[PDB]
């Protein structure tokens, strides 16, 4: 009996240290061993180190002497404590039972120097040359924008067939995705199809018609 | 430290049949050796613990073998729920270590990929920048090829690929393929052709246009 669960800041930046917080339901802190797991891209993951039911520490050599976890035995929680890090810091970390029985649901800690930027929204319209066929690809550029993550949608949400989104790449610490639709022919551009992106971080909400 | 190799890498099936997946230490580890099983936007979870010890709540079909340096997970009559990413962890020696994971697919005819290409906006070009945008949807198997040629010459910086996984739906996968230029280098040339290779077709799916066209 006991569920985890992770929280923490999803931005730091190589001059910051990282801190995270597991918090421990059902049973105490000191009832068992826990540890912070992390994968990295790629599907890596790493065992990062434990901490036992009474306090003592073991850390992965390769985090040597960057790491620290430490519990407070009265609110039932216990954290991760990284230093120097870097953008080769940037994953996804969860919270676990030492032997991987029980896990948090997991939380991303994206490193970086980048600076809040928004995003530019360019509209990917058909050539003249493939506008032939049964149906049309349409597209939306999101680029040059931080931190993650945007919301796109089409037509408000109205549109969510044939739709393709891709996931975000970096260009040179800023952030960009496409999102593609397909829709028949006949229906477009007679039937508008608009591009729809959202940037929480740079309050930025805005439409274009493709 | 220890490395644990699995294999295969890619594990491609059928609903119903039944799959076996390998997991080798680079040395004994014993027993001490867990299965876990991981979805997108998921924690992963303990399926199999010290090579054959069954976990509670999980499914019949999930069993565990091995011992020493090799190990075996298997899945007796996959269902559509158990695909997604497979990874072993040993206990033996510290630092625990995880293999590299087998992703585990579900099979499907091969479909050839729609492809489509899409020229600088002229919004973009007024900042500055020509992204050229090739998008090449609901293609199986997974395995494609993406080249970029400008007036004939194969390009590759500047290129930037993006994958979707598995589509739960019709288990295709899709790829956008962009070519980042400055407006500068982009008006210095004319046709651009985004060209797929994939095993649907013997010769690769062209799609290009001129600068002086539209």
């Known amino acids: 009996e006991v569920q985890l669960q992770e929280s923490g800041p999803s931005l730091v930046k190589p001059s910051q240290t990282l801190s995270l917080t597991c918090s421990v339901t059902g049973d105490s802190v000191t009832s068992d061993y826990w540890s912070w797991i992390r994968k990295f891209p790629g599907n890596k993951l790493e065992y990062m180190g434990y901490?036992?039911?009474?306090?003592?520490?073991y850390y992965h050599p390769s985090l040597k002497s960057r790491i620290s976890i430490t519990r407070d035995t009265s609110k039932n929680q216990y954290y991760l404590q990284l230093n120097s890090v870097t953008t080769e810091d940037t994953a996804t970390y969860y919270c676990?039972?030492?032997?991987?029985?029980?896990w948090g649901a997991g939380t991303t800690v994206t490193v970086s120097s980048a600076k809040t930027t928004a995003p530019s929204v360019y509209p990917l319209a058909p050539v003249c040359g493939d506008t032939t066929g049964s149906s049309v690809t349409l597209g939306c550029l999101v680029k040059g924008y931080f931190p993650e993550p945007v919301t796109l949608t089409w037509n408000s949400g109205s549109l969510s067939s044939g739709v393709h989104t891709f996931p975000a790449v970096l260009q040179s610490d800023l952030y960009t995705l496409s999102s593609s639709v397909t829709v028949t022919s006949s229906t477009w551009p007679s039937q508008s199809i608009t591009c729809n992106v959202a940037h929480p971080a740079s309050s930025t909400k805005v439409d274009k018609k493709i | 430290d220890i490395v644990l190799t699995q294999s295969p890498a890619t594990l491609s099936v059928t609903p119903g049949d039944s799959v076996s997946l390998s997991c080798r230490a680079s040395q004994s580890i014993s027993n001490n050796l867990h299965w876990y099983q991981q979805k997108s936007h998921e924690s992963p979870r303990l399926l199999i613990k010290?090579?054959?010890q069954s976990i509670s709540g999980i499914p019949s079909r999930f069993s565990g073998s091995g011992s020493g340096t090799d190990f075996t997970l298997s899945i007796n009559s996959v269902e559509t729920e158990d695909f997604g990413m497979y990874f072993c962890?040993?206990?033996?020696?510290?630092?625990?270590?995880f293999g590299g994971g087998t992703k585990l697919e579900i099979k499907r005819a091969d479909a050839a990929p729609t492809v489509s290409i899409f020229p600088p906006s002229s919004e973009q070009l007024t900042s500055g920048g020509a992204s050229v945008v090739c998008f090449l949807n609901n293609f199986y198997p997974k395995d494609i090829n993406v080249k970029w040629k400008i007036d004939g010459s194969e390009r590759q910086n500047g290129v930037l690929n993006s994958w979707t996984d598995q589509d739960s739906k019709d288990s295709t996968y899709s790829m956008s393929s962009t070519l980042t230029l400055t407006k500068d280098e982009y008006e210095r040339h004319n046709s651009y052709t985004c060209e797929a290779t994939h095993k649907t077709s013997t010769s690769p799916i062209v799609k290009s246009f001129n600068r002086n066209e539209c």
């Open positions: 962890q040993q206990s033996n020696s510290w630092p625990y270590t």
């Open positions: 676990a039972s030492w032997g991987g029985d029980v």
């Open positions: 010290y090579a054959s």
């Open positions: 901490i036992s039911y009474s306090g003592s520490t």
